[PDB]
Amino acid sequence: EYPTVSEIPVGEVRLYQIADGVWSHIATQSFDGAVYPSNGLIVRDGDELLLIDTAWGAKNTAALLAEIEKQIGLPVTRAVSTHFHDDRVGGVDVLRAAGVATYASPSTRRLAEVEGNEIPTHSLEGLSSSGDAVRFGPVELFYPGAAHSTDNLVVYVPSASVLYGGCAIYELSRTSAGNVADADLAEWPTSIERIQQHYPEAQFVIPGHGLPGGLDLLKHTTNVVKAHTNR
C-alpha cells in the first residue's frame, strides 16, 4: 500500500514501485506548523537512474540517496527539479556533493536563486513556452503553462504511461488549496487542460503530494482550484 504521511518520520524516505524501472519517492517535512508528505520520481536510465525532484531538504535527500543505493543499487547521475520551491530543489547541494548533475529550466533556476533556495547547475532548454515538450533520457518534460507556479513542469514516462504532475496536480482526497502564494489561479485550469490534451494515454498520475490516481486527478484538481477562486 502507498505510504501515508503518518507512517514516514521526518528524515526517512520510502520508495514505491509504480512499474518496471519506475518508482516514486515519498518524504515528509514541516510547512507552516504541520508535516506533509511529498512525492518525487525515479526512472531507470540504462545502467543509471534519473531522479525527478529532491526529497524536500538536505537531510531527506541524503536519506533518499541512501535508500536508493540499498534497494536499487544503481547510481543517480542526473536530477531534474520541476519548480523552484524547497520540496523540489531543497537537497540539490547534497545531490551535487554526491556526484549528481542537476537540471532545471532557466526560469526555475532564476526563481530559486532570487528566493534564497538551492540552484540546479544546468539549464533545460526548449521549455520556455506553454505546450513545449523536450526529451530527457527515458522521460518527456512538458511545460503546461502557469499553475501551482509559473515555472512548473510535468514529467511523463512513455515506457509506462506514468504522468508525474508535481504540485500542479492535487490528490483526490484534497478539497482545499494552499499553498497558492505563487500560483496563477487564472491560467491553472487551462494548464490542466493542456496536460489532458498531451497525455490522454496516461494510466498512472502522481500528484506532488499524496496518493497516486488516474487522469481523474486532473479534473478534480481543476474543481479545487476553481472552488478556491469563487470564494
- Give the per-residue contact string, 14-33, with ligand 5Z2 (x = CB under 6 A; - = no): -----------------x--
Please say if 228 is a catalytic residue: no
CB of 90 to Zn ion, least distance (A): 11
228 interacts with ligand 5Z2 by CB under 6 A: no
Q: Which is nearer to ligand 5Z2, 45 or 86 (CB)?
A: 86
DSSP secondary structure string, 83-95? SSSHHHHTTHHHH
Q: Which is nearer to ligand 5Z2, 17 or 223 (CB)?
A: 223
Q: Which of residues 49-78 bind ligand 5Z2 (CB under 6 A)?
A: 56
Please say if 83 is a catalytic residue: yes
Q: How far is CA 148 from CA 131, 179, 184, in A?
A: 16, 8, 7
Each as own residue / partner, the long-range contacts of residues 64-67 (CB below 8 Å, 24 or more positions apart, any chain) are: 64/13, 64/25, 64/27, 64/40, 64/91, 65/94, 65/95, 65/98, 66/13, 67/13, 67/14, 67/15, 67/25
Q: Cβ-count burial of 1 within 10 angstroms (0-12 exposed, 13-18 middle, 19+ buried)?
A: exposed
Selection from Zn ion, ligand 5Z2, none that 174 binds (CB < 5 to 8 A by kind) is ligand 5Z2
List the grid coordinates of 191.
494548464
Interface segment toward ligand 5Z2; rule CB under 6 A; list 16-24, 70-78, 126-134, 166-174: 166-174
Please say if 25 is a catalytic residue: no
Q: Which amino acid is at 127?
A: L
CB of 181 to ligand 5Z2, least distance (A): 9
Residue 152 preceded by cis peptide, ω within 30? no
Q: Which residues belong to the active site?
A: 83, 85, 87, 148, 179
Task: Give residues in contact with ligand 5Z2 (CB under 6 A).
Answer: 31, 36, 38, 56, 87, 148, 167, 170, 174, 178-179, 208-209
